Amino acid sequence: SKPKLCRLLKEDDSYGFHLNAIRGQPGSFVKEVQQGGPADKAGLENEDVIIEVNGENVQEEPYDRVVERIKSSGKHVTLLVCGK
């Protein structure tokens, strides 16, 4: 449940995690956190839910749009996430 605010620095052109969606509901969830990658260093865990990308609420955005937002963020990205 706890909210987590973090800022990630791209390494190997990647943040070292992926997003998925759940059928029947909006929202974007973390999966596949690469051990020792940027996301992992920031304590992101699988099934963490993306709340804000760079201060913008993305909870009503399909996850592919959220992926595009994160990609478009450049060499850093700030995320607010909620664990479940």
Side-chain angles (χ1 to χ4, degrees), residues 1-67 69-70 72-74 76-84:
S1 304
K2 253 58 139 63
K4 277 180 277 180
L5 191 56
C6 63
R7 171 170 190 262
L8 292 56
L9 173 60
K10 227 173 185 154
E11 295 178 32
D12 299 336
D13 198 21
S14 178
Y15 296 106
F17 74 106
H18 293 125
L19 292 173
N20 72 81
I22 298 185
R23 295 299 247 90
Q25 48 184 91
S28 307
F29 306 89
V30 170
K31 65 169 185 175
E32 296 167 350
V33 172
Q34 298 192 0
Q35 175 183 320
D40 186 52
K41 284 183 192 93
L44 303 200
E45 320 185 55
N46 308 325
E47 307 178 48
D48 276 0
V49 185
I50 312 302
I51 308 309
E52 299 180 352
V53 173
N54 298 323
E56 305 210 59
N57 189 284
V58 297
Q59 287 182 277
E60 299 319 298
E61 289 247 287
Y63 84 99
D64 51 283
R65 281 193 228 146
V66 177
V67 170
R69 270 182 193 252
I70 292 164
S72 294
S73 187
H76 289 267
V77 73
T78 298
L79 301 171
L80 181 68
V81 313
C82 267
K84 211 65 260 162

Coordinates of all heavy atoms in Angstrom, one line a residue, unseen atoms left out:
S1 N 0.8 -1.3 0.0 CA 0.0 0.0 0.0 C 0.8 1.3 0.0 O 0.4 2.3 -0.6 CB -0.9 0.0 1.2 OG -1.8 -1.2 1.2
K2 N 2.0 1.2 0.6 CA 2.9 2.4 0.8 C 3.3 3.1 -0.5 O 3.7 2.4 -1.4 CB 4.1 2.1 1.7 CG 4.0 2.7 3.1 CD 2.8 2.2 3.9 CE 3.1 1.9 5.3 NZ 3.6 3.1 6.1
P3 N 3.2 4.4 -0.5 CA 3.6 5.2 -1.7 C 5.1 5.4 -1.7 O 5.7 5.6 -0.7 CB 2.9 6.5 -1.6 CG 2.2 6.5 -0.3 CD 2.8 5.4 0.5
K4 N 5.7 5.4 -2.9 CA 7.1 5.5 -3.1 C 7.4 6.5 -4.1 O 6.8 6.5 -5.2 CB 7.7 4.2 -3.5 CG 8.0 3.2 -2.5 CD 8.6 1.9 -3.0 CE 7.5 0.9 -3.5 NZ 8.1 -0.3 -4.0
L5 N 8.2 7.5 -3.8 CA 8.6 8.5 -4.8 C 10.1 8.2 -5.1 O 11.0 8.1 -4.2 CB 8.5 9.9 -4.1 CG 8.7 11.1 -5.1 CD1 7.8 11.1 -6.3 CD2 8.5 12.3 -4.2
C6 N 10.4 8.1 -6.4 CA 11.8 7.9 -6.9 C 12.1 8.5 -8.2 O 11.3 8.9 -9.0 CB 12.2 6.4 -6.9 SG 11.1 5.6 -8.1
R7 N 13.4 8.7 -8.4 CA 13.9 9.3 -9.7 C 14.9 8.3 -10.2 O 15.8 7.9 -9.4 CB 14.5 10.6 -9.4 CG 15.3 11.2 -10.6 CD 15.6 12.7 -10.2 NE 16.1 13.4 -11.4 CZ 17.3 13.6 -11.7 NH1 18.3 13.1 -10.9 NH2 17.7 14.3 -12.7
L8 N 14.7 7.9 -11.4 CA 15.6 6.9 -12.0 C 16.5 7.5 -13.1 O 16.1 8.3 -13.8 CB 14.8 5.8 -12.7 CG 13.9 4.8 -11.8 CD1 13.0 5.5 -10.9 CD2 13.2 3.9 -12.7
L9 N 17.7 7.0 -13.1 CA 18.7 7.4 -14.1 C 18.8 6.2 -15.1 O 19.2 5.1 -14.6 CB 20.1 7.6 -13.5 CG 21.2 7.8 -14.5 CD1 21.0 9.0 -15.4 CD2 22.5 7.9 -13.7
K10 N 18.6 6.4 -16.4 CA 18.7 5.4 -17.4 C 20.2 4.8 -17.4 O 21.2 5.5 -17.3 CB 18.4 6.0 -18.7 CG 17.4 5.2 -19.6 CD 17.0 6.0 -20.8 CE 15.9 5.3 -21.6 NZ 15.0 6.1 -22.4
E11 N 20.3 3.5 -17.5 CA 21.6 2.8 -17.7 C 21.4 1.8 -18.8 O 20.3 1.2 -18.8 CB 21.9 2.0 -16.4 CG 22.2 2.8 -15.2 CD 22.5 1.9 -14.0 OE1 23.1 0.8 -14.3 OE2 22.1 2.2 -12.9
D12 N 22.4 1.6 -19.6 CA 22.2 0.8 -20.8 C 20.9 1.2 -21.6 O 20.2 0.3 -22.1 CB 22.1 -0.7 -20.6 CG 23.3 -1.2 -20.0 OD1 24.4 -0.6 -20.2 OD2 23.2 -2.3 -19.3
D13 N 20.6 2.5 -21.6 CA 19.4 3.0 -22.3 C 18.1 2.4 -21.8 O 17.1 2.2 -22.5 CB 19.5 2.8 -23.8 CG 18.6 3.6 -24.7 OD1 18.1 4.7 -24.2 OD2 18.3 3.3 -25.8
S14 N 18.1 2.0 -20.5 CA 16.9 1.3 -20.0 C 16.7 1.7 -18.5 O 17.7 2.0 -17.8 CB 17.2 -0.2 -20.1 OG 16.2 -1.0 -19.5
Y15 N 15.5 1.6 -18.0 CA 15.2 1.7 -16.6 C 15.2 0.4 -15.9 O 15.0 0.3 -14.6 CB 14.0 2.5 -16.3 CG 14.1 4.0 -16.7 CD1 13.4 4.4 -17.8 CD2 15.0 4.8 -16.0 CE1 13.5 5.8 -18.2 CE2 15.1 6.1 -16.4 CZ 14.4 6.6 -17.5 OH 14.6 8.0 -17.9
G16 N 15.3 -0.7 -16.6 CA 15.4 -2.1 -16.0 C 14.1 -2.6 -15.3 O 14.1 -3.2 -14.3
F17 N 13.0 -2.3 -16.0 CA 11.7 -2.8 -15.6 C 10.8 -2.8 -16.8 O 11.0 -2.1 -17.7 CB 11.1 -2.1 -14.3 CG 10.5 -0.7 -14.6 CD1 9.1 -0.5 -14.6 CD2 11.4 0.4 -14.7 CE1 8.7 0.8 -14.7 CE2 10.9 1.6 -14.8 CZ 9.5 1.8 -14.9
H18 N 9.7 -3.5 -16.7 CA 8.6 -3.4 -17.6 C 7.3 -3.1 -16.9 O 7.1 -3.1 -15.7 CB 8.5 -4.7 -18.4 CG 9.6 -5.0 -19.2 ND1 10.4 -6.1 -19.2 CD2 10.2 -4.2 -20.2 CE1 11.4 -6.0 -20.0 NE2 11.3 -4.9 -20.6
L19 N 6.3 -2.7 -17.8 CA 4.9 -2.5 -17.3 C 3.9 -3.5 -18.0 O 4.1 -3.9 -19.1 CB 4.5 -1.1 -17.5 CG 5.2 0.0 -16.7 CD1 4.7 1.4 -17.3 CD2 4.9 -0.1 -15.3
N20 N 2.9 -3.9 -17.2 CA 1.8 -4.6 -17.7 C 0.4 -3.9 -17.3 O 0.4 -3.1 -16.4 CB 1.8 -6.1 -17.3 CG 1.5 -6.4 -15.9 OD1 0.3 -6.4 -15.3 ND2 2.6 -6.5 -15.1
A21 N -0.6 -4.4 -17.9 CA -2.0 -4.1 -17.5 C -2.7 -5.3 -17.0 O -2.2 -6.4 -17.2 CB -2.7 -3.5 -18.7
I22 N -3.8 -5.1 -16.4 CA -4.8 -6.1 -15.9 C -6.0 -6.0 -16.8 O -6.5 -4.9 -17.1 CB -5.1 -5.9 -14.4 CG1 -3.7 -6.1 -13.7 CG2 -6.1 -7.0 -13.9 CD1 -3.7 -6.1 -12.2
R23 N -6.5 -7.1 -17.3 CA -7.7 -7.1 -18.1 C -8.9 -6.5 -17.3 O -9.0 -6.8 -16.1 CB -8.1 -8.5 -18.5 CG -7.1 -9.2 -19.4 CD -7.0 -8.4 -20.7 NE -7.5 -9.3 -21.8 CZ -8.8 -9.2 -22.2 NH1 -9.7 -8.4 -21.7 NH2 -9.1 -10.1 -23.2
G24 N -9.7 -5.7 -17.9 CA -10.9 -5.1 -17.2 C -10.7 -3.9 -16.3 O -11.7 -3.4 -15.7
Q25 N -9.5 -3.4 -16.1 CA -9.3 -2.3 -15.3 C -8.2 -1.4 -15.9 O -7.3 -1.9 -16.6 CB -8.9 -2.7 -13.9 CG -7.9 -3.7 -13.8 CD -7.6 -4.2 -12.4 OE1 -8.2 -5.1 -11.9 NE2 -6.7 -3.5 -11.7
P26 N -8.3 -0.1 -15.7 CA -7.1 0.7 -16.1 C -5.9 0.5 -15.2 O -6.1 -0.1 -14.1 CB -7.7 2.2 -16.0 CG -8.8 2.0 -15.0 CD -9.4 0.7 -15.2
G27 N -4.8 1.1 -15.6 CA -3.6 1.1 -14.7 C -2.4 0.4 -15.2 O -2.6 -0.6 -16.0
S28 N -1.3 0.7 -14.6 CA 0.0 0.2 -15.1 C 0.8 -0.4 -13.9 O 0.9 0.3 -12.9 CB 0.8 1.3 -15.7 OG 0.1 1.9 -16.7
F29 N 1.2 -1.6 -14.0 CA 1.9 -2.3 -12.9 C 3.3 -2.7 -13.3 O 3.5 -3.1 -14.4 CB 1.0 -3.5 -12.6 CG -0.4 -3.2 -12.3 CD1 -1.4 -3.1 -13.4 CD2 -0.8 -2.8 -11.1 CE1 -2.7 -2.7 -13.1 CE2 -2.1 -2.4 -10.8 CZ -3.1 -2.4 -11.9
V30 N 4.2 -2.6 -12.4 CA 5.7 -3.0 -12.6 C 5.8 -4.5 -12.6 O 5.2 -5.2 -11.8 CB 6.5 -2.4 -11.4 CG1 7.9 -2.9 -11.4 CG2 6.4 -0.9 -11.4
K31 N 6.6 -5.0 -13.6 CA 7.1 -6.3 -13.6 C 8.5 -6.4 -14.1 O 9.1 -5.4 -14.6 CB 6.2 -7.2 -14.5 CG 6.2 -6.9 -15.9 CD 5.4 -7.9 -16.7 CE 5.6 -7.6 -18.2 NZ 5.0 -8.7 -19.1
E32 N 9.2 -7.6 -13.9 CA 10.5 -7.8 -14.5 C 11.5 -6.8 -14.1 O 12.2 -6.2 -15.0 CB 10.3 -7.9 -16.0 CG 9.5 -9.2 -16.4 CD 9.0 -9.2 -17.8 OE1 9.1 -8.2 -18.6 OE2 8.5 -10.3 -18.2
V33 N 11.6 -6.5 -12.8 CA 12.6 -5.6 -12.3 C 14.0 -6.3 -12.3 O 14.2 -7.3 -11.6 CB 12.3 -5.1 -10.9 CG1 13.4 -4.3 -10.3 CG2 11.0 -4.3 -10.9
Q34 N 14.9 -5.8 -13.2 CA 16.2 -6.4 -13.4 C 17.0 -6.2 -12.1 O 17.2 -5.0 -11.6 CB 16.9 -5.7 -14.5 CG 16.2 -5.9 -15.9 CD 17.0 -5.5 -17.1 OE1 18.2 -5.1 -16.9 NE2 16.5 -5.7 -18.3
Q35 N 17.5 -7.2 -11.6 CA 18.4 -7.1 -10.4 C 19.6 -6.2 -10.7 O 20.4 -6.4 -11.6 CB 18.8 -8.5 -9.9 CG 19.7 -8.5 -8.8 CD 20.2 -9.8 -8.3 OE1 19.4 -10.7 -8.2 NE2 21.5 -9.9 -7.9
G36 N 19.7 -5.3 -9.8 CA 20.8 -4.2 -9.8 C 20.6 -3.2 -10.8 O 21.5 -2.3 -11.0
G37 N 19.5 -3.2 -11.5 CA 19.2 -2.1 -12.5 C 18.6 -0.9 -11.8 O 18.4 -0.8 -10.6
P38 N 18.3 0.2 -12.6 CA 17.9 1.5 -12.0 C 16.6 1.4 -11.1 O 16.6 1.9 -10.0 CB 17.5 2.3 -13.3 CG 18.5 1.8 -14.2 CD 18.5 0.3 -14.0
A39 N 15.6 0.7 -11.6 CA 14.3 0.5 -10.9 C 14.6 -0.3 -9.6 O 14.1 0.1 -8.5 CB 13.3 -0.2 -11.8
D40 N 15.4 -1.3 -9.7 CA 15.7 -2.1 -8.5 C 16.4 -1.3 -7.4 O 16.1 -1.6 -6.2 CB 16.6 -3.3 -8.9 CG 16.8 -4.3 -7.8 OD1 15.8 -4.8 -7.2 OD2 18.0 -4.7 -7.6
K41 N 17.3 -0.5 -7.8 CA 18.1 0.3 -6.8 C 17.2 1.3 -6.1 O 17.4 1.6 -4.9 CB 19.2 1.1 -7.6 CG 20.4 0.2 -8.0 CD 21.5 1.0 -8.6 CE 22.6 0.3 -9.3 NZ 22.3 0.1 -10.8
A42 N 16.1 1.6 -6.7 CA 15.1 2.5 -6.1 C 13.9 1.8 -5.4 O 13.0 2.4 -4.8 CB 14.5 3.3 -7.2
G43 N 14.1 0.4 -5.3 CA 13.2 -0.4 -4.5 C 11.8 -0.7 -5.2 O 10.9 -1.1 -4.4
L44 N 11.8 -0.6 -6.5 CA 10.5 -0.9 -7.2 C 10.4 -2.4 -7.2 O 11.4 -3.1 -7.3 CB 10.4 -0.4 -8.6 CG 10.6 1.1 -8.8 CD1 10.0 1.5 -10.2 CD2 9.9 2.0 -7.8
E45 N 9.2 -2.8 -7.0 CA 8.9 -4.2 -6.9 C 7.8 -4.6 -7.9 O 6.9 -3.7 -8.2 CB 8.5 -4.6 -5.5 CG 9.3 -3.8 -4.5 CD 9.0 -4.2 -3.0 OE1 9.1 -5.4 -2.7 OE2 8.7 -3.3 -2.2
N46 N 7.8 -5.8 -8.3 CA 6.7 -6.3 -9.1 C 5.3 -6.0 -8.4 O 5.1 -6.2 -7.2 CB 7.0 -7.7 -9.5 CG 8.5 -7.9 -10.1 OD1 9.0 -7.0 -10.8 ND2 9.2 -9.0 -9.7
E47 N 4.4 -5.7 -9.3 CA 3.0 -5.3 -8.9 C 2.9 -3.9 -8.3 O 1.7 -3.5 -8.0 CB 2.2 -6.3 -8.2 CG 2.2 -7.7 -8.8 CD 1.5 -8.7 -8.0 OE1 0.4 -8.4 -7.5 OE2 2.1 -9.8 -7.8
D48 N 3.9 -3.2 -8.1 CA 3.9 -1.8 -7.8 C 3.1 -1.1 -8.9 O 3.2 -1.4 -10.1 CB 5.2 -1.1 -7.7 CG 5.9 -1.2 -6.4 OD1 5.4 -1.9 -5.5 OD2 7.0 -0.7 -6.3
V49 N 2.2 -0.2 -8.5 CA 1.3 0.5 -9.4 C 1.9 1.9 -9.6 O 2.2 2.7 -8.7 CB -0.1 0.6 -8.8 CG1 -1.0 1.3 -9.8 CG2 -0.6 -0.7 -8.3
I50 N 1.9 2.3 -10.9 CA 2.4 3.7 -11.3 C 1.3 4.7 -11.1 O 0.1 4.6 -11.6 CB 2.8 3.8 -12.8 CG1 3.8 2.6 -13.1 CG2 3.4 5.1 -13.1 CD1 5.1 2.5 -12.3
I51 N 1.6 5.6 -10.2 CA 0.6 6.7 -9.9 C 0.8 8.0 -10.8 O -0.1 8.5 -11.4 CB 0.5 7.0 -8.4 CG1 0.3 5.8 -7.6 CG2 -0.6 8.1 -8.2 CD1 -0.9 4.9 -8.1
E52 N 2.1 8.5 -10.7 CA 2.5 9.7 -11.5 C 3.8 9.4 -12.2 O 4.7 8.8 -11.6 CB 2.7 10.9 -10.5 CG 1.4 11.3 -9.8 CD 1.5 12.5 -8.9 OE1 2.7 13.0 -8.7 OE2 0.5 13.0 -8.4
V53 N 3.9 9.9 -13.4 CA 5.2 10.0 -14.1 C 5.5 11.5 -14.2 O 4.7 12.2 -14.9 CB 5.0 9.3 -15.5 CG1 6.3 9.6 -16.3 CG2 4.7 7.8 -15.4
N54 N 6.6 11.9 -13.7 CA 7.0 13.3 -13.7 C 5.9 14.2 -13.3 O 5.5 15.2 -13.9 CB 7.5 13.7 -15.1 CG 8.8 13.0 -15.5 OD1 9.6 12.7 -14.7 ND2 8.9 12.6 -16.8
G55 N 5.3 13.8 -12.2 CA 4.3 14.6 -11.5 C 2.9 14.6 -12.1 O 2.0 15.3 -11.6
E56 N 2.7 13.8 -13.2 CA 1.4 13.7 -13.8 C 0.7 12.4 -13.5 O 1.3 11.4 -13.7 CB 1.6 13.9 -15.3 CG 2.3 15.2 -15.7 CD 1.9 15.7 -17.0 OE1 0.7 16.0 -17.2 OE2 2.8 15.8 -17.9
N57 N -0.5 12.5 -13.1 CA -1.3 11.3 -12.8 C -1.5 10.5 -14.0 O -2.1 11.0 -15.0 CB -2.6 11.6 -12.1 CG -3.2 10.3 -11.5 OD1 -3.8 9.5 -12.3 ND2 -3.1 10.1 -10.2
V58 N -1.1 9.2 -14.0 CA -1.3 8.3 -15.2 C -2.2 7.1 -14.9 O -2.3 6.1 -15.7 CB 0.1 7.9 -15.7 CG1 0.9 9.0 -16.2 CG2 0.8 7.1 -14.6
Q59 N -3.0 7.2 -13.8 CA -3.8 6.0 -13.4 C -4.9 5.7 -14.4 O -5.4 4.5 -14.4 CB -4.4 6.3 -12.0 CG -3.4 6.3 -10.9 CD -4.0 6.5 -9.6 OE1 -4.2 7.6 -9.2 NE2 -4.4 5.5 -8.9
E60 N -5.4 6.7 -15.2 CA -6.4 6.4 -16.2 C -5.8 6.1 -17.6 O -6.6 6.1 -18.5 CB -7.4 7.6 -16.3 CG -8.1 7.8 -15.0 CD -8.6 6.6 -14.2 OE1 -9.4 5.8 -14.7 OE2 -8.1 6.4 -13.0
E61 N -4.5 6.0 -17.7 CA -3.8 5.9 -19.0 C -3.5 4.4 -19.2 O -3.1 3.8 -18.2 CB -2.5 6.7 -18.9 CG -2.7 8.2 -19.0 CD -2.2 8.8 -20.2 OE1 -1.0 8.9 -20.4 OE2 -3.1 9.2 -21.1
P62 N -3.8 3.9 -20.4 CA -3.4 2.5 -20.6 C -1.9 2.4 -20.5 O -1.1 3.3 -20.9 CB -3.8 2.2 -22.1 CG -4.8 3.3 -22.4 CD -4.5 4.4 -21.6
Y63 N -1.4 1.3 -20.1 CA 0.0 1.1 -19.8 C 0.9 1.4 -21.0 O 2.0 1.8 -20.8 CB 0.2 -0.3 -19.2 CG 0.4 -1.3 -20.3 CD1 1.7 -1.7 -20.7 CD2 -0.7 -1.8 -21.1 CE1 1.9 -2.6 -21.8 CE2 -0.5 -2.6 -22.1 CZ 0.8 -3.0 -22.5 OH 1.0 -3.9 -23.5
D64 N 0.4 1.1 -22.2 CA 1.3 1.4 -23.4 C 1.6 2.9 -23.5 O 2.6 3.3 -24.0 CB 0.7 0.9 -24.7 CG -0.7 1.4 -24.8 OD1 -1.6 0.8 -24.2 OD2 -0.9 2.4 -25.6
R65 N 0.6 3.8 -23.1 CA 0.8 5.2 -23.1 C 1.8 5.7 -22.0 O 2.5 6.6 -22.2 CB -0.5 6.0 -22.9 CG -1.4 6.1 -24.1 CD -2.6 7.1 -24.0 NE -3.9 6.5 -24.4 CZ -5.0 6.8 -23.9 NH1 -5.1 7.7 -22.9 NH2 -6.1 6.2 -24.3
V66 N 1.7 5.0 -20.9 CA 2.6 5.2 -19.8 C 4.1 4.8 -20.2 O 5.0 5.5 -19.9 CB 2.2 4.5 -18.5 CG1 3.2 4.7 -17.3 CG2 0.8 4.9 -18.1
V67 N 4.2 3.6 -20.8 CA 5.5 3.3 -21.4 C 6.0 4.4 -22.3 O 7.2 4.7 -22.2 CB 5.4 1.9 -22.2 CG1 6.7 1.7 -23.0 CG2 5.1 0.7 -21.3
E68 N 5.2 4.9 -23.2 CA 5.6 6.0 -24.1 C 6.0 7.2 -23.3 O 7.0 7.8 -23.7 CB 4.6 6.3 -25.2
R69 N 5.3 7.6 -22.3 CA 5.6 8.7 -21.4 C 7.0 8.6 -20.8 O 7.8 9.5 -20.8 CB 4.6 8.9 -20.3 CG 3.5 9.8 -20.6 CD 2.6 9.9 -19.4 NE 1.4 10.5 -19.7 CZ 1.0 11.8 -19.4 NH1 1.7 12.6 -18.7 NH2 -0.2 12.2 -19.8
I70 N 7.3 7.4 -20.3 CA 8.6 7.1 -19.6 C 9.7 7.2 -20.6 O 10.7 7.8 -20.4 CB 8.5 5.8 -18.9 CG1 7.6 5.8 -17.7 CG2 9.9 5.4 -18.4 CD1 7.1 4.6 -17.1
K71 N 9.4 6.6 -21.8 CA 10.5 6.6 -22.9 C 10.8 8.0 -23.3 O 12.0 8.3 -23.5 CB 10.0 5.9 -24.1 CG 9.6 4.4 -23.8
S72 N 9.8 8.8 -23.5 CA 9.9 10.2 -23.9 C 10.5 11.1 -22.8 O 10.7 12.3 -23.0 CB 8.5 10.8 -24.2 OG 7.9 10.2 -25.4
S73 N 10.7 10.5 -21.6 CA 11.2 11.4 -20.4 C 12.7 11.7 -20.5 O 13.2 12.6 -19.9 CB 11.0 10.7 -19.1 OG 11.3 11.5 -18.0
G74 N 13.5 11.0 -21.3 CA 14.9 11.3 -21.6 C 15.7 10.4 -20.7 O 15.5 9.3 -20.6
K75 N 16.8 11.0 -20.1 CA 17.8 10.2 -19.4 C 17.4 9.9 -17.9 O 18.0 9.1 -17.2 CB 19.1 10.8 -19.4 CG 19.4 11.8 -18.3
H76 N 16.5 10.7 -17.4 CA 15.9 10.5 -16.0 C 14.4 10.4 -16.1 O 13.8 10.8 -17.1 CB 16.2 11.6 -15.1 CG 17.6 11.7 -14.7 ND1 18.1 11.1 -13.5 CD2 18.7 12.4 -15.2 CE1 19.4 11.4 -13.3 NE2 19.8 12.2 -14.4
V77 N 13.8 9.8 -15.1 CA 12.3 9.8 -14.9 C 12.0 9.8 -13.4 O 12.7 9.1 -12.6 CB 11.5 8.7 -15.7 CG1 11.7 7.3 -15.1 CG2 10.1 9.0 -15.8
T78 N 11.0 10.6 -13.0 CA 10.5 10.6 -11.7 C 9.2 9.9 -11.6 O 8.3 10.1 -12.5 CB 10.4 12.0 -11.1 OG1 11.7 12.6 -11.2 CG2 9.9 12.1 -9.7
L79 N 9.0 8.9 -10.7 CA 7.9 8.1 -10.6 C 7.3 8.2 -9.1 O 8.1 8.1 -8.1 CB 8.2 6.7 -10.9 CG 8.8 6.4 -12.3 CD1 9.3 4.9 -12.4 CD2 7.8 6.7 -13.4
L80 N 6.0 8.2 -9.0 CA 5.3 8.0 -7.7 C 4.6 6.6 -8.0 O 3.9 6.5 -8.9 CB 4.3 9.1 -7.4 CG 3.5 9.0 -6.1 CD1 4.4 9.2 -4.9 CD2 2.3 9.9 -6.1
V81 N 4.8 5.7 -7.1 CA 4.3 4.3 -7.2 C 3.7 3.9 -5.9 O 4.0 4.5 -4.8 CB 5.4 3.4 -7.7 CG1 6.1 3.9 -8.9 CG2 6.4 3.0 -6.6
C82 N 2.7 3.0 -5.9 CA 2.1 2.5 -4.7 C 2.3 1.0 -4.8 O 2.0 0.4 -5.7 CB 0.6 2.8 -4.7 SG 0.2 4.3 -3.9
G83 N 2.9 0.5 -3.7 CA 3.0 -1.0 -3.6 C 1.6 -1.5 -3.3 O 0.7 -0.8 -3.0
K84 N 1.4 -2.8 -3.5 CA 0.1 -3.4 -3.2 C 0.1 -4.5 -2.2 O 0.8 -4.4 -1.1 CB -0.4 -4.0 -4.6 CG -2.0 -4.0 -4.7 CD -2.5 -2.6 -4.7 CE -3.0 -2.1 -3.4 NZ -3.2 -0.6 -3.3

